[PDB]
Design a protein around this ligand. Structure first.
Ligand SMILES: CCCCC/C=C\C/C=C\C/C=C\C/C=C\CCCC(=O)O
Ligand SMILES: CCCCC/C=C\C/C=C\C/C=C\C/C=C\CCCC(=O)O
Length: 158
């Protein structure tokens, strides 16, 4: 159909989360040690964007296969960026722990986990059946990644 649904609410959520994840990746990749308060702030922006997506999308009708198809690439890219973020964070465990931030990072990751779960549960109600398996796999990959981050930092605080 040439009729285009206003899917701007979905696009906005993807964009807001992407901006937060990308900013975190910029800062983590250049982090080599020292105070990590800015990284925790980046994490907080990401949690707030995630929670905002739950609030923005709660009442949106489910996506058709055609509507979902236009969001597939954007979602896949965002999944890739989130998995990069988690791996980048784990890669910087040593300077983070040296700086006395390991517990703070653990705490932030536990909040990321809870927010991601809320959004994932909501997204599962909006995706059409044709994309349900692939969406669940992308969601599970994110959830499992966050947990690997939690495992990496668990108990490393002062
Ligand atoms: C495979 C694409 C399915 C259609 C997409 C439907 C809704 C996505 C819209 C908003 C959710 C916001 C961000 C998604 C973040 C990470 C990857 C989600 C994986 C998934 O759970 O999809
Ligand atoms: C100081 C710690 C900062 C860590 C920040 C780095 C990574 C956090 C990882 C994941 C959270 C990011 C985005 C959540 C996006 C969508 C929720 C899943 C929706 C779905 O799947 O449908």
């Amino acid at each position: 159909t040439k009729v285009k649904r206003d899917i701007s609410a979905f696009q906005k959520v993807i964009q807001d989360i992407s901006l937060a994840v990308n900013k975190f990746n910029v800062d983590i990749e250049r982090y080599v040690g020292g105070d990590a308060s800015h990284l925790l702030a980046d994490g907080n922006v990401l949690i707030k964007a995630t929670l905002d997506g739950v609030q923005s999308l709660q009442n949106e009708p489910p996506l058709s296969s055609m509507e979902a198809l236009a969001l597939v690439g954007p979602v896949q890219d965002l999944s890739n960026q989130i998995l990069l973020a988690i791996q980048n964070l784990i890669d910087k465990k040593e300077p983070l722990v040296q700086a006395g931030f390991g517990g703070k990072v653990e705490n932030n990751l536990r909040q990321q986990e809870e927010a991601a779960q809320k959004l994932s549960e909501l997204v599962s109600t909006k995706v059409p059946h044709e994309l349900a398996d692939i969406s669940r796999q992308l969601s599970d990959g994110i959830a499992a990644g966050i947990k690997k981050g939690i495992d990496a930092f668990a108990g490393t605080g002062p």
